[model samples]
Target: DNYADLSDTELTTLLRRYNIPHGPVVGSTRRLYEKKIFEYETQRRRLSPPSSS
Candidate 1:
């Protein structure tokens, strides 16, 4: 998702946009956020089904 092109601020914006849940730990890292994004998006897609045309 071109994550290397974005800054931490941009990543934070995306996390908020997707409403990704955060853990109780403080001082999280970019990789942490990226991981959550991947995990959440994957789970989201798994929950959604394609419709028959």
Candidate 2:
């Protein structure tokens, strides 16, 4: 909801959580920050190798 309001640390946390393979999205809001998080998450997974168990 207020992703832009977040600091880098918070945003980064959010991004990571959003991209958490399964879930950072560092927030408890009424909705998502969508497009913003998607980009970071996709880029992150794209660069990293597949996760191992």
Candidate 3:
């Protein structure tokens, strides 16, 4: 997924869908948001409990 290519609205939707904490990330450039969101998703997956079979 090339988040770099996504528009602001696209990124916003993704952030909302994931309900990223402190999502009011205003003033921050899209680049930073992209990086943070990616990292957030990564950590969330690892932190989540194991899936049921």
Candidate 4:
């Protein structure tokens, strides 16, 4: 699970509680999370995607 330790149902409940609008994982909080995830992904990919250019 991407969000391991957290059950799917629990995640769903929190998602609803937070009223997270579903869409591409890039905008606002998603963008923030993506920025962090991108850093990790770049490290894994061994190819920097550029620094918020």
Candidate 5:
């Protein structure tokens, strides 16, 4: 698991970079967290304003 065992700081930073909320991520295990982040990122990106275009 590349994302597993990430220190809180690393995890937080990664999520922050992706703009995903880092709250529920408090205790999310590696696999679960990865899944959550992807879902979150996808949703966030889609919900985001056509800020890029």
Candidate 6:
């Protein structure tokens, strides 16, 4: 069930196709998806990056 195997371009395209905003950090797509925080099948769109603040 690991999705991080996808390339950067693939992840970007998937995100855009789903209308999900990409993070500002490099490799964020991979990181988020790998951590199970981002899912293409999920409907929850994160309004902002996770933070402790």
Q: Whose lDDT is greatest here?
A: 3
RMSD values for the candidates in order, in angstroms, are 6.3, 9.3, 5.3, 9.9, 5.2, 6.1
Measured on C-alpha atoms, candidate 3 has an lDDT of 0.64
How would you encode candidate 3's per-residue C-alpha lDDT over 1-53 as one tens digit per residue? 68857776877776666665445657565556666677776655336556863
Worst 10 residues of 3 by lDDT: 41-50
The regions of model 4 sitting more than 4 angstroms off are: 23-53
Q: Where does model 1 exceed 4 Å of error?
A: 23-28, 42-53
Q: Residue-wise lDDT of candidate 2 within 1-53, one digit each (tens)?
A: 45557675665466556553424344553124444565655554345656863
lDDT of each: 0.62, 0.51, 0.64, 0.42, 0.60, 0.54
lDDT of 5 by residue, 26-48 (tens): 56354455666665655454366
lDDT of 1: 0.62
The TM-score that candidate 4 achieves is 0.32
lDDT of 6 by residue, 1-53 (tens): 44647666756566555556556436635566434335444655554656753
TM-score of each: 0.51, 0.32, 0.49, 0.32, 0.43, 0.43
lDDT of 1 by residue, 1-53 (tens): 67678776766676667766544323556677766677666555234446853
- Clash pairs, candidate 6, are none
- Flag the better candidate by lDDT, 1 or 3: 3
Clash pairs, candidate 5, are none
**Tens-digit per-residue lDDT, 1-53, candidate 4:** 25445454544444444444434443355433333433343454234357763
Question: Model 3, stretches more than 4 Å misplaced?
Answer: 22-27, 43-53
Indicate the TM-score of model 2.
Answer: 0.32
